[PDB]
Amino acid sequence: SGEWEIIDIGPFTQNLGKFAVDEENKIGQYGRLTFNKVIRPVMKKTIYENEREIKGYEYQLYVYASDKLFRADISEDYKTRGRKLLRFNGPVPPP
């Protein structure tokens, strides 16, 4: 199951946005991008399994990179804390 909250922007969200841009630059579809900012709202999904136990998270962010707005989804595994870029699409309209 997934449960949801909005988290505020600050260094943690800035670094999620920078992670997303670095990961997208590995793929190369949009050429080389450079991070500009994360804007509100930042969604945090917590993924539960079994007896309402956290398996991991997904952060869904609007990120300006190279002056274009993208939607990035980043997974984070609870056990390992490992993060991955799941989706990076755009450009997209501002929220």
Numbering used by the authors: 0 to 94
Q: How did the manuscript describe this experimental structure?
A:
In this study, we focused on the Cys41 residue of SCM, which is a single cysteine residue present at a structurally important position. However, this substitution may destabilize SCM because Cys41 is buried in the hydrophobic core of the protein.
The yield of the C41V mutant was the highest among all the mutants, while the yields of C41A, C41L, and C41S were comparable to that of the WT, indicating no significant differences in expression levels among the SCM mutants. Differential scanning fluorimetric analysis revealed that substituting Cys41 with Ala or Val increased the thermal stability of SCM, while substitution with Ser or Leu decreased its stability. Furthermore, under all three different pH conditions the relative order of the Tm values of the SCM mutants was the same; that is, C41A > C41V > WT > C41S > C41L. The SCM C41A and C41V mutants were crystallized under slightly different conditions, resulting in having different space groups (i.e., P1 for C41A, and P21 for C41V). The crystals of both mutants contained two protein molecules that formed a dimer in the asymmetric unit. Models for all 94 residues were successfully constructed for the C41V mutant, while the models for the loop between the β2 and β3 strands (i.e., residues Glu48–Arg51) in the C41A mutant could not be constructed due to poor electron densities. The overall structures of SCM C41A and C41V were almost identical to that of the WT. A comparison of crystal structures revealed that the conformers of the side chains of Thr12 and Leu60 differed among the C41A, WT, and C41V variants. The crystal structures of SCM mutants indicated that the side chains of Ala41 and Val41 are in close proximity to hydrophobic residues, as was the case for Cys41.
